[PDB]
C-alpha cells in the first residue's frame, strides 16, 4: 500500500537493475514470488550479458579483404617516416664534423647540441624499424596453405610417372 513495487515502471526498473547485476536500491521484493523472479532474471542475465559482449567484440573485426587493403595502407606509410628519420642522422653526422674540424674557432655549445641531437636521431631511426618487422610478422601466418599444398600434390603425382 505505497505504490513502490506495484508500479509497472518501478518493476521495470527493478528488473533492469537486477539483470545487469548492479543490485537493488530501495526496492526489494516483499514476497517470495518477486524474489524467485529476480533470481531467475539474474541467472539469465549472468550469461546473456557475456554472450552479448562476445558478439559485439567479434563484430568489430576486419575481414580478409579489408585486411589486405589495410596492410597496403600501413605499408604506404612507415617509409616516409623511415626516410625522414634516416636523413637526420646523415645531417647531424656532417654538422658535427663541420663544427669540429672546419671553423677556425671551436664553439663548444653547438657541438654539444649536435651531439645531443645525433643520439635522438639514432634512437628514432632504430625505433621506427620495429614496426616494419611487426607488420610483416602479423601479415604472415595468414596464407591459406591449402591451395599450394594441392598444387604441389598434383605436380608430384604427375612426376610419379617418371
Amino acid at each position: 500500500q505505497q505504490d513502490v513495487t506495484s508500479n509497472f515502471l518501478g518493476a521495470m526498473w527493478l528488473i533492469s537493475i537486477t539483470f545487469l547485476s548492479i543490485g537493488y536500491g530501495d526496492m526489494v521484493p516483499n514476497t517470495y514470488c518477486g524474489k524467485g523472479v529476480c533470481l531467475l532474471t539474474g541467472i539469465m542475465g549472468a550469461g546473456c550479458t557475456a554472450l552479448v559482449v562476445a558478439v559485439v567484440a567479434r563484430k568489430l573485426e576486419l575481414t580478409k579483404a579489408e585486411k589486405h587493403v589495410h596492410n597496403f595502407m600501413m605499408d604506404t606509410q612507415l617509409t616516409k617516416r623511415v626516410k625522414n628519420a634516416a636523413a637526420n642522422v646523415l645531417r647531424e653526422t656532417w654538422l658535427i664534423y663541420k663544427n669540429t674540424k672546419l671553423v677556425k674557432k671551436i664553439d663548444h655549445a653547438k657541438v654539444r647540441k649536435h651531439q645531443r641531437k645525433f643520439l635522438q636521431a639514432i634512437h628514432q631511426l632504430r625505433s621506427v624499424k620495429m614496426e616494419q618487422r611487426k607488420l610483416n610478422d602479423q601479415a604472415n601466418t595468414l596464407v591459406d596453405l591449402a591451395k599450394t599444398q594441392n598444387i604441389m600434390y598434383d605436380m608430384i603425382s604427375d612426376l610419379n610417372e617418371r
Partner: protein, 144 residues
C-alpha cells in the same frame, strides 16, 4: 591533376617497382602481393599484369599506371558491371548466350517481363538472326 596527386601514385610506383629500373615485372608484383599475405598463382599474376599493359612490352610503366589509377579512383563504370551480369549466366566460358535461355531467364527469374517485351528484346538483340546472341555488341549498342 594536382602535383600532389602526381607525387601520389609515384610514392606507390616506388613501392611496386623495386630495385629501380623503372619497370614492374611479374616477379616484383608477386613479391609485393605475397608480402601482404596474398598467394596469387602464375595465371592470376599474368592476367593482372595483362589487364594494365598496353604497350605489349610485358612491363608496366608510370604512364600505364596513371591511366588506370585516375579511373579506378572514382566513378562507377556501368559497362564493367552489365558485362558481369551477362556472364553470370554464361558458365561455358565463351562469349555467346543462347536465345532460348536468355528468354527463359528474362521471363522467369525476377521481376518477370511479358512475352511481347522479351520477344522485342530478342528481335532487337539477335542482329544476325542465327539464334546465338553475343551480348557484347548488345552492350556496345545499348550502353553507349
Amino acid at each position: 591533376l594536382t602535383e600532389e596527386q602526381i607525387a601520389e601514385f609515384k610514392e606507390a610506383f616506388s613501392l611496386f617497382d623495386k630495385d629501380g629500373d623503372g619497370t614492374i615485372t611479374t616477379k616484383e608484383l608477386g613479391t609485393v602481393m605475397r608480402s601482404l599475405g596474398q598467394n596469387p598463382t602464375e595465371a592470376e599474376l599474368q592476367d593482372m599484369i595483362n589487364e594494365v599493359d598496353a604497350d605489349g612490352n610485358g612491363t608496366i610503366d608510370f604512364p600505364e599506371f596513371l591511366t588506370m589509377m585516375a579511373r579506378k579512383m572514382k566513378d562507377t563504370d556501368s559497362e564493367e558491371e552489365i558485362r558481369e551480369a551477362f556472364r553470370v549466366f554464361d558458365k561455358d566460358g565463351n562469349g555467346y548466350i543462347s536465345a532460348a535461355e536468355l528468354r527463359h531467364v528474362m521471363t522467369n527469374l525476377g521481376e518477370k517481363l511479358t512475352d511481347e517485351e522479351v520477344d522485342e528484346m530478342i528481335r532487337e538483340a539477335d542482329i544476325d538472326g542465327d539464334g546465338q546472341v553475343n551480348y557484347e555488341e548488345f552492350v556496345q549498342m545499348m550502353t553507349a
